[PDB]
């Protein structure tokens with residue numbers, strides 16, 4: 145009745161635990177919060193030059209923010225920081241109704257419907273904006 | 281295809297914030313885990329003799345474990361330890377195929393369908409089993 149946003153894809157990725165945790169002696173730690181809804185995420189990174197070698201997250205939030213965090217990590221590991229930022233910008237364009245590169249986003253496109261729920265847009269965007277700040 | 285278990289009731293209650301937190305100088309603190317899923321809950325209690333005056337939880341988990349925790353807290357605050365244990369016994373009976381008292385459960389009946397998913401039964405039961413240990 146008002147929970148339609150929660151697709152099978154979102155609920156699967158929300159419960160994924162493989163990227164949840166801390167990285168000891170991380171090269172970068174970045175905390176983000178979407179206090180409108182009450183979500184928090186802490187991203188931990190290892191880099192090798194400009195390559196993202198590993199990412200884990202701590203904290204917890206709604207199923208949209210957690211699903212988004214997990215699909216984000218799964219897609220940015222092994223990429224360069226520039227590539228992850230290009231992906232981020234496209235993820236944000238997708239929510240703002242602007243134009244985006246489907247090939248760049250891959251399975252991130254499964255969050256397309258979130259843009260129909262303007263408060264949950266912040267939930268989807270939290271890990272990505274957190275990533276943006278961290279990588280600059 | 282698998283998100284059917286996630287009703288509006290469950291999704292609304294999984295996001296509830298008013299019971300999430302610690303109680304300083306709690307009269308009882310009990311931790312519980314459902315490792316097959318990755319769910320954690322720490323329950324904090326204040327009592328006045330046999331009456332449950334306040335309950336909060338920390339930790340996080342799936343939508344079913346978090347929804348169940350919040351519905352439990354909402355229903356047990358202001359009851360006696362024994363009323364809470366009787367609710368708990370009924371909730372577990374529901375999950376197994378056994379007989380239960382609908383008037384004792386109230387909105388806890390909204391989880392009836394979970395019993396068709398043996399793995400998720402543990403998610404539902406996590407707060408209740410943790411409560412049982414805490415109170416006895």
Ligand code: NI
Nearest residue numbers: 145146147148
């Ligand atoms: Ni709904």
Ligand code: NI
Nearest residue numbers: 164202203340
């Ligand atoms: Ni955790």
Ligand code: NI
Nearest residue numbers: 173174277278
């Ligand atoms: Ni920073």
Ligand code: NI
Nearest residue numbers: 281282283284
């Ligand atoms: Ni489904």
Ligand code: NI
Nearest residue numbers: 204300301339
């Ligand atoms: Ni919390």
Ligand code: NI
Nearest residue numbers: 309310413414
């Ligand atoms: Ni104990």
Ligand SMILES: [Zn+2]
Nearest residue numbers: 181183206267
């Ligand atoms: Zn959220």
Ligand SMILES: [Zn+2]
Nearest residue numbers: 317319342403
């Ligand atoms: Zn669970």
